[PDB]
Amino acid sequence: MKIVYWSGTGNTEKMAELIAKGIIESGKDVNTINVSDVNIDELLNEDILILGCSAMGDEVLEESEFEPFIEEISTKISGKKVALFGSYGWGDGKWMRDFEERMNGYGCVVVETPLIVQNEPDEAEQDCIEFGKKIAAI
Numbered sequence: 001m002k003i004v005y006w007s008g009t010g011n012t013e014k015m016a017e018l019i020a021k022g023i024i025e026s027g028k029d030v031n032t033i034n035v036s037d038v039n040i041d042e043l044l045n046e047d048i049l050i051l052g053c054s055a056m057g058d059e060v061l062e063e064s065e066f067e068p069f070i071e072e073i074s075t076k077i078s079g080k081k082v083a084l085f086g087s088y089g090w091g092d093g094k095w096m097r098d099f100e101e102r103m104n105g106y107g108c109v110v111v112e113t114p115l116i117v118q119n120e121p122d123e124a125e126q127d128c129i130e131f132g133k134k135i136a137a138i
């Protein structure tokens with residue numbers, strides 16, 4: 001499996017690593033990929049796209065890198081299962097509610113409730129691992 005993410009301070013990166021840990025504990029292989037290094041063709045071969053990005057701008061996806069990536073794959077993912085996650089700060093998930101609506105609008109099947117954690121995981125570390133386990137159980 002693959003996990004593609006954007007992280008500005010490492011909070012979403014930590015989430016990505018914990019989600020990976022959960023998938024691995026479930027017995028499956030998974031690679032975590034920073035959005036700057038993503039191979040689009042290889043990502044599209046996956047049965048489940050696990051995508052993560054923190055809340056940026058005013059409740060939007062990161063603009064220089066993550067956003068363009070979503071735009072590029074947008075027309076090539078109808079029917080694909082996707083799992084979404086990200087870290088946030090002062091809000092309550094607006095950017096993620098929009099991210100979920102967006103992917104649904106592209107015809108994706110959002111497999112689990114998006115995982116959102118405030119700042120660095122910490123107490124929420126297990127929540128990250130468990131989200132990975134849910135994805136692996138599909």
Ligand SMILES: Cc1cc2nc3c(=O)[nH]c(=O)nc-3n(C[C@H](O)[C@H](O)[C@H](O)COP(=O)(O)O)c2cc1C
Pocket residue numbers: 006007008009010011012013053054055056057058059060087088089090091092093095118119120
């Ligand atoms: C310029 C900027 C904009 C942000 N916009 C939001 C926002 O609209 N809502 C929110 O809850 N947090 C927002 N945050 C907070 C980040 O989402 C939060 O610090 C998160 O833990 C960052 O994760 P990361 O290290 O993976 O980037 C913003 C942070 C920055 C740097």
